[PDB]
Amino acid sequence: LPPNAPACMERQLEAARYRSDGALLLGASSLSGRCWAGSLWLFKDPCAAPNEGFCSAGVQTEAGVADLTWVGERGILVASDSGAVELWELDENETLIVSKFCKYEHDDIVSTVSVLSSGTQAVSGSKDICIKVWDLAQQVVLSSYRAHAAQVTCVAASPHKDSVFLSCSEDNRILLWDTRCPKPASQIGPGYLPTSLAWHPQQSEVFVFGDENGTVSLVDTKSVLSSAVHSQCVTGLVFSPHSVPFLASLSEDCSLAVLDSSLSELFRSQAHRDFVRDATWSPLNHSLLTTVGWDHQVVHHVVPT
Amino acid sequence: RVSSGRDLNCVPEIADTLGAVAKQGFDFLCMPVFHPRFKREFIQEPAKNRPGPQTRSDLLLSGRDWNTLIVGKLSPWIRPDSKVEKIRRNSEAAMLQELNFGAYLGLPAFLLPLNQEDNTNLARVLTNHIHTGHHSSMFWMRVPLVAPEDLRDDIIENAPTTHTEEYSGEEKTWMWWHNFRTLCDYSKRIAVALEIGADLPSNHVIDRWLGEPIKAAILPTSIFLTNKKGFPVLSKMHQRLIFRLLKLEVQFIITGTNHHSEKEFCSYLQYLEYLSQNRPPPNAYELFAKGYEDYLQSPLQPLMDNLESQTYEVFEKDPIKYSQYQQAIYKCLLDRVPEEEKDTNVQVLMVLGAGRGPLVNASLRAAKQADRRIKLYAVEKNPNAVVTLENWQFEEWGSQVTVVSSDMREWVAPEKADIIVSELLGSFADNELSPECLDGAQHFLKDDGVSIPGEYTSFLAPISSSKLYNEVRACREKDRDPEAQFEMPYVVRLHNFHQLSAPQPCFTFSHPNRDPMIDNNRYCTLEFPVEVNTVLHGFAGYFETVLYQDITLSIRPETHSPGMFSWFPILFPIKQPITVREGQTICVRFWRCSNSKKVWYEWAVTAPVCSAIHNPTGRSYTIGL
Ligand SMILES: Cn1ncc(-c2ccc3c(=O)[nH]nc(CN)c3c2)c1-c1ccc2ccccc2c1C#N
Ligand SMILES: CSC[C@H]1O[C@@H](n2cnc3c(N)ncnc32)[C@H](O)[C@@H]1O
């Protein structure tokens, strides 16, 4: 029960991310009931989540949390329903979660956010069809791009190229970006709408994307391998930290799956009773995998390697 | 005063949000009734059995607040026309669920998007909801002037934006709306929420929405420019569109976050109030005609029917009309009586259809200023108005005016007339049987007699107006032909409409008619060039008349008698709308038919597509002789 930490946490757990030492960051939204808002939580004890009484730090946000990500070890970057991108930071003692800035630049819900390689900049996507590049130090928008024609579903930064990142929208476009080019967007080719993106950690030109129909595909920049992993939309794709990494896939079918290098299934968990929203691999125990969902469950899976 | 609303896709607390929106100056608030990110399953387990509540409680606002302050919004994830079947099923049930919750709340309006070409299943679900009960709730279809794909930044290297003009492609959003409402069978509860973009399209694209049932205009904060003092303003072209929308009296909606963070958020709304106060006030006519916009009226038949007292009062509240009459009488007296005969020659003036006597007074004032002697007859067949004339004649006019309570076609005049004055004209000139009445009175006009008016001509113009078509469509009555409302004209102050071509003359009549074989039947073929794409719903009618020489009365817009309140335009509808492409010619045919009892109009469209012949044998509409 830390100070200025809410006594009750929102039901719809939206995001879960581990940092270096192994502490767990949680994002929750109130998607029903009287108040529609969100909260941020830090659990240095991953097995104690989602219990608020045994958390390290917590704070409330003015609106819901559609997406978040770490910014280093003490920074938390948040995509708010209010159209604002927010940056929170832990104090020196890591008992509070203080707001750094709250800038309202998107005209609709901010749906996705991602931190570039240098850690000094971030890219955001929103239902306002726009994609913005942020200067985390100056707390301003460096660029506002409008390449899509529908709402942006996901934006994912390149692991080592600070000017490269991916984005997918419901206009059926997957755009490869590079702010070094006069026209930074480039389309990658009829299929179903893409819904999730994940760069390959050990291959600069390789990434995977899921569609609204449950297919996970493996793509290279220039010449395709795909497998029907889920019966509904593919929500998230997160690679494991192993040398030859595994691929965890999420879906609205309330099921987690782990895939090998050839998109073949190795693990399967139906422990969730609602949508599965995020997944994060433990840095301490590379075989452990933690997922969260709207059923308010925080499951710690043992993935057989 | 401008009626404006605030659009939000994020409401943490209804009480707090609605209070802040009201304090800023808005009248209503567009918010989602479910959480826009709260995707809900309906078929597959275990996600379908998600414990409730599914959304906020209705107790959070009073029934009055839900009825007047809230506009619902369909959730963005609901795509009834998705190519994935599971997404369709869930979207169909969710659309019914959200719509039914809005009707449960008694919400006055619900917003639904038109963001793509194929909304066939979206229309089916909405049409199903409309036919599930008896409700008056409005459905605002959010549709942009420019489709998003056509306004995206030219920043994709291997997929540039086209620079060559696509005259029809730039009008694709209107086709989205047209097909949608056509599938929905022109439901009266389905209106347009036109979303204005940063870059306005070509004028023809904006002119597409002329005559469309636009109920709301959505102005994103992104389109507002910035002046020297940092306040949000609009380009002069945007201001032009705002003024046209203020005439339709649409409700404006502000969407998007505050991009002028220095100024408080009510700066956008204050600018709309600013633009509204800066426009010309009602100029006499618009002060009189306001309230009658697109209001259908049955054309008066003053021959078959006897007009009420307050109908004559409407005729008499237009001095510009009768000063034209007086001036016509003034010029005619001087041309018929030379100066040396000013005292010996007394002209016989006969007002044919005097009503309550405004023409009689105009005749008296004309003879005075012309310094000539006149003998006045006031003919009127309406005995109730004869009461007004005879009390006038006893108290003021005296023996100079002879009131005759008789039909001008049957009255046996004791002498022949030098000048006959009449006001037997309708919105379509001859649609009150002025030719038939003056033909029967022609015998007691001297061989060199002058008829005022001397001639009149009717004009027709093809118009586009989905609202007026719907207004006509809603005039079906229980015990007659189900399509009779489409085969009769209406007198209406045409407001929300688009005239597709310059009006052209239709029928013309001259008085006196010296021709030996008098035939008032007519048959006229007109070809109207159309330089746009549109949907033809009917033909507007006007008229011009010559009182004497150069003195005229006119409701034809290009020659409209300035300052004349009398006579609204007339409207001839067609049973079925007709698509017209750019460059095509609309060809209409009109007949003036008659027998011994009745006179009526028949009309047909022959190009680019044939319509049915309307009002054959006057089965739906006749004008009694
Ligand atoms: C419905 N209808 N059909 C014809 C007329 C009309 C109007 C004016 C004159 C006129 O001024 N002179 N003569 C004639 C007939 N000869 C005359 C006829 C109307 C009428 C009726 C009451 C109104 C009340 C308020 C606003 C408009 C009107 C209208 C309209 N326009
Ligand atoms: C000013 S509207 C037309 C007027 O002319 C009158 N009127 C119309 N037709 C005739 C007619 N045939 N004989 C006499 N008065 C007529 C009407 O009753 C009304 O007063």
mmCIF file of C-alpha atoms in Angstrom, chain A residues 51-220:
data_model
loop_
_atom_site.group_PDB
_atom_site.id
_atom_site.type_symbol
_atom_site.label_atom_id
_atom_site.label_comp_id
_atom_site.label_asym_id
_atom_site.label_seq_id
_atom_site.Cartn_x
_atom_site.Cartn_y
_atom_site.Cartn_z
ATOM 1 C CA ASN A 51 -2.814 -7.632 -5.791
ATOM 2 C CA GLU A 52 -2.548 -3.908 -5.065
ATOM 3 C CA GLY A 53 -1.660 -4.384 -1.390
ATOM 4 C CA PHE A 54 1.616 -6.065 -2.356
ATOM 5 C CA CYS A 55 2.895 -3.709 -5.066
ATOM 6 C CA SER A 56 6.000 -1.536 -5.230
ATOM 7 C CA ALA A 57 4.391 1.614 -6.666
ATOM 8 C CA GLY A 58 1.165 2.768 -8.263
ATOM 9 C CA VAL A 59 -0.573 5.815 -9.683
ATOM 10 C CA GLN A 60 -3.818 6.741 -11.444
ATOM 11 C CA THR A 61 -4.179 8.238 -14.929
ATOM 12 C CA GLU A 62 -6.941 10.564 -16.103
ATOM 13 C CA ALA A 63 -8.000 8.186 -18.896
ATOM 14 C CA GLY A 64 -7.501 4.608 -20.048
ATOM 15 C CA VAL A 65 -4.230 2.962 -21.019
ATOM 16 C CA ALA A 66 -4.345 1.681 -24.592
ATOM 17 C CA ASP A 67 -0.610 0.862 -24.725
ATOM 18 C CA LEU A 68 2.614 1.548 -22.847
ATOM 19 C CA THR A 69 6.325 0.715 -22.795
ATOM 20 C CA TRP A 70 9.394 1.318 -20.667
ATOM 21 C CA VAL A 71 11.705 4.240 -21.386
ATOM 22 C CA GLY A 72 14.967 2.967 -19.938
ATOM 23 C CA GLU A 73 14.629 1.732 -16.362
ATOM 24 C CA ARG A 74 12.537 4.496 -14.742
ATOM 25 C CA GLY A 75 10.559 5.950 -17.678
ATOM 26 C CA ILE A 76 7.022 4.890 -18.599
ATOM 27 C CA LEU A 77 5.521 6.046 -21.904
ATOM 28 C CA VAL A 78 1.738 5.743 -22.153
ATOM 29 C CA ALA A 79 -0.836 5.893 -24.961
ATOM 30 C CA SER A 80 -3.934 7.507 -23.428
ATOM 31 C CA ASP A 81 -7.539 7.431 -24.618
ATOM 32 C CA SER A 82 -7.536 11.250 -24.185
ATOM 33 C CA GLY A 83 -5.455 11.659 -27.374
ATOM 34 C CA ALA A 84 -2.417 12.409 -25.219
ATOM 35 C CA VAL A 85 0.923 10.652 -25.023
ATOM 36 C CA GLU A 86 2.107 10.653 -21.416
ATOM 37 C CA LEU A 87 5.523 10.102 -19.851
ATOM 38 C CA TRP A 88 5.756 9.042 -16.211
ATOM 39 C CA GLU A 89 8.975 8.528 -14.266
ATOM 40 C CA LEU A 90 9.858 6.721 -11.057
ATOM 41 C CA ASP A 91 11.433 8.761 -8.291
ATOM 42 C CA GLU A 92 14.888 7.958 -6.926
ATOM 43 C CA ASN A 93 13.341 5.675 -4.297
ATOM 44 C CA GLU A 94 10.953 4.006 -6.814
ATOM 45 C CA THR A 95 7.999 4.373 -4.430
ATOM 46 C CA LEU A 96 6.105 6.962 -6.516
ATOM 47 C CA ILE A 97 5.207 7.224 -10.203
ATOM 48 C CA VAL A 98 5.315 10.926 -11.094
ATOM 49 C CA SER A 99 4.052 12.453 -14.334
ATOM 50 C CA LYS A 100 6.780 14.037 -16.474
ATOM 51 C CA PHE A 101 4.644 15.524 -19.262
ATOM 52 C CA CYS A 102 1.129 15.137 -20.685
ATOM 53 C CA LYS A 103 0.782 16.501 -24.230
ATOM 54 C CA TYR A 104 -2.488 16.332 -26.196
ATOM 55 C CA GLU A 105 -1.461 16.036 -29.852
ATOM 56 C CA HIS A 106 -3.659 13.270 -31.306
ATOM 57 C CA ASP A 107 -7.274 14.066 -32.175
ATOM 58 C CA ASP A 108 -8.511 10.564 -31.249
ATOM 59 C CA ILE A 109 -7.457 7.647 -29.041
ATOM 60 C CA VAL A 110 -3.728 6.925 -29.092
ATOM 61 C CA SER A 111 -3.636 3.192 -29.790
ATOM 62 C CA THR A 112 0.054 2.256 -30.057
ATOM 63 C CA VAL A 113 3.413 3.606 -28.912
ATOM 64 C CA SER A 114 7.009 2.444 -29.311
ATOM 65 C CA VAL A 115 10.482 3.669 -28.341
ATOM 66 C CA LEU A 116 13.186 3.963 -31.000
ATOM 67 C CA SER A 117 16.706 2.566 -30.656
ATOM 68 C CA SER A 118 18.397 5.607 -29.104
ATOM 69 C CA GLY A 119 15.764 5.750 -26.359
ATOM 70 C CA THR A 120 15.552 9.523 -26.902
ATOM 71 C CA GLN A 121 12.623 9.371 -29.355
ATOM 72 C CA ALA A 122 9.349 7.498 -29.697
ATOM 73 C CA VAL A 123 6.679 6.912 -32.329
ATOM 74 C CA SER A 124 2.941 6.831 -31.643
ATOM 75 C CA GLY A 125 -0.122 5.715 -33.554
ATOM 76 C CA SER A 126 -3.723 6.718 -33.079
ATOM 77 C CA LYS A 127 -7.241 6.270 -34.411
ATOM 78 C CA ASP A 128 -6.879 9.771 -35.905
ATOM 79 C CA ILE A 129 -4.984 8.048 -38.779
ATOM 80 C CA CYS A 130 -1.802 9.949 -37.852
ATOM 81 C CA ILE A 131 1.639 8.740 -36.760
ATOM 82 C CA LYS A 132 3.847 11.086 -34.732
ATOM 83 C CA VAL A 133 7.554 11.064 -33.857
ATOM 84 C CA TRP A 134 8.308 12.440 -30.391
ATOM 85 C CA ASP A 135 11.313 14.139 -28.790
ATOM 86 C CA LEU A 136 11.206 12.739 -25.256
ATOM 87 C CA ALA A 137 13.701 15.333 -23.993
ATOM 88 C CA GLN A 138 12.075 18.438 -25.497
ATOM 89 C CA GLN A 139 8.562 17.009 -24.882
ATOM 90 C CA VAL A 140 7.490 18.025 -28.402
ATOM 91 C CA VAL A 141 6.430 16.361 -31.645
ATOM 92 C CA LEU A 142 9.228 16.232 -34.209
ATOM 93 C CA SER A 143 7.131 14.946 -37.124
ATOM 94 C CA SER A 144 3.453 14.225 -37.782
ATOM 95 C CA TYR A 145 2.891 11.804 -40.662
ATOM 96 C CA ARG A 146 -0.431 10.962 -42.312
ATOM 97 C CA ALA A 147 0.387 8.068 -44.614
ATOM 98 C CA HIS A 148 -2.508 5.770 -43.715
ATOM 99 C CA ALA A 149 -6.164 6.169 -44.654
ATOM 100 C CA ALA A 150 -7.707 4.366 -41.647
ATOM 101 C CA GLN A 151 -6.887 4.029 -37.952
ATOM 102 C CA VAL A 152 -3.366 2.899 -37.064
ATOM 103 C CA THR A 153 -3.341 -0.460 -35.279
ATOM 104 C CA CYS A 154 0.319 -0.866 -34.314
ATOM 105 C CA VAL A 155 3.692 0.870 -34.579
ATOM 106 C CA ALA A 156 6.930 -0.944 -33.722
ATOM 107 C CA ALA A 157 10.395 0.599 -33.652
ATOM 108 C CA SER A 158 13.441 -1.013 -35.207
ATOM 109 C CA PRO A 159 15.717 -2.638 -32.596
ATOM 110 C CA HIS A 160 18.948 -1.001 -33.822
ATOM 111 C CA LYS A 161 18.046 1.526 -36.565
ATOM 112 C CA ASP A 162 16.818 4.666 -34.810
ATOM 113 C CA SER A 163 15.138 6.054 -37.953
ATOM 114 C CA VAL A 164 13.376 2.819 -38.994
ATOM 115 C CA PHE A 165 10.081 1.480 -37.656
ATOM 116 C CA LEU A 166 7.031 -0.466 -38.803
ATOM 117 C CA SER A 167 3.347 0.415 -38.767
ATOM 118 C CA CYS A 168 0.113 -1.281 -39.793
ATOM 119 C CA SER A 169 -3.398 0.096 -40.185
ATOM 120 C CA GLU A 170 -6.897 -1.008 -41.110
ATOM 121 C CA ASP A 171 -6.365 0.456 -44.590
ATOM 122 C CA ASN A 172 -4.630 -2.914 -45.246
ATOM 123 C CA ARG A 173 -1.184 -1.261 -45.451
ATOM 124 C CA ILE A 174 2.011 -2.348 -43.722
ATOM 125 C CA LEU A 175 4.387 0.608 -44.004
ATOM 126 C CA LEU A 176 8.154 0.394 -43.531
ATOM 127 C CA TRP A 177 9.387 3.789 -42.341
ATOM 128 C CA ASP A 178 12.786 5.474 -42.602
ATOM 129 C CA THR A 179 12.970 9.183 -41.705
ATOM 130 C CA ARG A 180 16.224 9.384 -43.663
ATOM 131 C CA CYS A 181 14.247 9.202 -46.958
ATOM 132 C CA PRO A 182 12.397 12.224 -48.409
ATOM 133 C CA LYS A 183 9.301 10.003 -48.503
ATOM 134 C CA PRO A 184 9.808 8.048 -45.256
ATOM 135 C CA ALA A 185 6.959 5.553 -45.761
ATOM 136 C CA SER A 186 7.204 2.466 -47.964
ATOM 137 C CA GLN A 187 4.468 -0.119 -48.489
ATOM 138 C CA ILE A 188 5.099 -3.868 -48.200
ATOM 139 C CA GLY A 189 2.856 -6.099 -50.303
ATOM 140 C CA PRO A 190 -5.184 -8.464 -50.905
ATOM 141 C CA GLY A 191 -4.867 -10.252 -47.564
ATOM 142 C CA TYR A 192 -6.594 -9.653 -44.259
ATOM 143 C CA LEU A 193 -6.071 -6.552 -42.142
ATOM 144 C CA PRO A 194 -2.797 -6.603 -40.160
ATOM 145 C CA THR A 195 -3.155 -6.278 -36.398
ATOM 146 C CA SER A 196 0.250 -6.888 -34.757
ATOM 147 C CA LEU A 197 3.919 -6.343 -35.585
ATOM 148 C CA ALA A 198 7.204 -7.632 -34.174
ATOM 149 C CA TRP A 199 10.719 -7.120 -35.502
ATOM 150 C CA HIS A 200 13.086 -10.061 -35.344
ATOM 151 C CA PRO A 201 15.621 -9.406 -32.553
ATOM 152 C CA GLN A 202 18.609 -11.031 -34.296
ATOM 153 C CA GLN A 203 17.781 -10.215 -37.948
ATOM 154 C CA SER A 204 17.616 -6.600 -39.096
ATOM 155 C CA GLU A 205 15.463 -7.172 -42.204
ATOM 156 C CA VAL A 206 13.016 -9.761 -40.803
ATOM 157 C CA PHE A 207 9.740 -9.210 -38.955
ATOM 158 C CA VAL A 208 6.444 -10.966 -38.258
ATOM 159 C CA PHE A 209 2.870 -9.702 -38.448
ATOM 160 C CA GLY A 210 -0.525 -11.093 -37.467
ATOM 161 C CA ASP A 211 -3.857 -10.422 -39.162
ATOM 162 C CA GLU A 212 -7.475 -10.062 -38.067
ATOM 163 C CA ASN A 213 -8.104 -13.690 -39.126
ATOM 164 C CA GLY A 214 -5.564 -15.380 -36.837
ATOM 165 C CA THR A 215 -2.591 -15.859 -39.184
ATOM 166 C CA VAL A 216 0.997 -15.208 -38.085
ATOM 167 C CA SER A 217 3.326 -14.521 -41.017
ATOM 168 C CA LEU A 218 7.115 -14.323 -41.353
ATOM 169 C CA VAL A 219 8.269 -11.581 -43.730
ATOM 170 C CA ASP A 220 11.588 -10.496 -45.222
#
